[PDB]
């Protein structure tokens, strides 16, 4: 009974591992060996946004690459104009423990959530002009850790109750529940076509989910500690993860295995955030040691370092046009980088 199912699971795992080993022929570094290295990356703080009173936990760029929203653990959701440094909105929150925020691709909504287990939707552009809560999504039994809009009516949320969910904002009800993780789910990343999405969890495993189907397709391992950050490659066929064991990895969906590892000997702090560039050549990652390290996605060579934050770097974003890079930190400052 139990022994039979344990043996069946062991055989299935052995078959999966054997298939992965068989498909492994050459490494990414071996193929990317004659490529000319990028060199060195010079990026300077072009803007610095102030106004948050406490630690900043999240930020999110708009699709126009000009506006961005940020979240602080003081109950504020501030919308910025990155070109002119002006503040467009300042939305006070009911709960003071926000841990994530999002920007609707249409630009009419911003989301929010945290320790209150609620995802709050805010109406930005309305005939009245003021900003008010449109919906409140309840049903998770753990803290909201990430949320990503698909359109003006659908949103995917991840929670510390080992479950991701897909919602319908118009009705306020869950549509699909994604189960299978054993630890808290920490991060989300939507595919470019919004047809799939990956999530990282505290059980050191990542999973690829089918939005319209609701089932787990592929499961990726390799990290030894909790996975804090996850991001898709611009192609849409690969993704990157950041973890507490001070390493970053690149996984290929089609090859179904890890390709590269981004680590260094003088790095012992965990990764808080991770992102890519427009071409996918650079892999920007935030760290607990107060700075951001720019990597080379094809050679694992550190192209540069972004320094200037007094405290821990918590969030990190890259514009849709590739123009600028924004980072938030626990010192309550948003710094925009370019170069």
């Amino acid at each position: 009974e139990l022994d039979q199912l344990r043996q069946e699971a062991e055989q299935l795992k052995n078959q999966i591992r054997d298939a992965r080993k068989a498909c492994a022929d050459a490494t990414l570094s071996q193929i990317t060996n004659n490529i000319d290295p990028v060199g060195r990356i010079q990026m300077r703080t072009r803007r610095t946004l102030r106004g948050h009173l406490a630690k900043i936990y999240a930020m999110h760029w708009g699709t126009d690459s000009r506006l961005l929203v940020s979240a602080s653990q003081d109950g504020k959701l501030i919308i910025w104009d990155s070109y002119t440094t002006n503040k467009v909105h300042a939305i006070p929150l009911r709960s003071s423990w926000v841990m994530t925020c999002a920007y609707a691709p249409s630009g009419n909504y911003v989301a929010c959530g945290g320790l209150d287990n609620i995802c709050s939707i805010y109406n930005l552009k309305t005939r009245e002009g003021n900003v008010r809560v449109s919906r409140e999504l309840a049903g998770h039994t753990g803290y909201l850790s990430c949320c990503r809009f698909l359109d003006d009516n659908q949103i995917v949320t991840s929670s510390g109750d080992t479950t991701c969910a897909l919602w319908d904002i118009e009705t306020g009800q869950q549509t699909t529940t994604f189960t299978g993780h054993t630890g808290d789910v920490m991060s989300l990343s939507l595919a470019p076509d919004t047809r799939l999405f990956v999530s990282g969890a505290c059980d050191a495993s990542a999973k690829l989910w089918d939005v319209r189907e609701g089932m787990c397709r592929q499961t990726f391992t390799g990290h030894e500690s909790d996975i804090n950050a996850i991001c898709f490659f611009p192609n849409g066929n690969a993704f990157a993860t950041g973890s507490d064991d001070a390493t970053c990895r690149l996984f290929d969906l089609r090859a179904d295995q890890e390709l590269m590892t981004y680590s260094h000997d003088n790095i012992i702090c965990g990764i808080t955030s991770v992102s890519f560039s427009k071409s996918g050549r650079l892999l920007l990652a935030g760290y607990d040691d107060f700075n951001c390290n720019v990597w080379d996605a094809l050679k694992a060579d550190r192209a540069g370092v972004l320094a200037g934050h007094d405290n821990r770097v918590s969030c990190l974003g890259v514009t849709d046009d590739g123009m600028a890079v924004a980072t938030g930190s626990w010192d309550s400052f948003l710094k925009i980088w370019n170069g």
Partner: protein
Amino acid sequence: TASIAQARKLVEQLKMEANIDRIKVSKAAADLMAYCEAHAKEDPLLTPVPASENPFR
């Protein structure tokens, strides 16, 4: 009564994850290289852009 159900659900999930077709790593790595080459001219963070059209100067 729930341990047997959880074990059978895990086995069912693992059966589905083992039926996919996997391509060689060499072809997978050759496609990421192809993407970066064809878009390296529109990565402002990689190739520096003159301040004439830079909106952050």
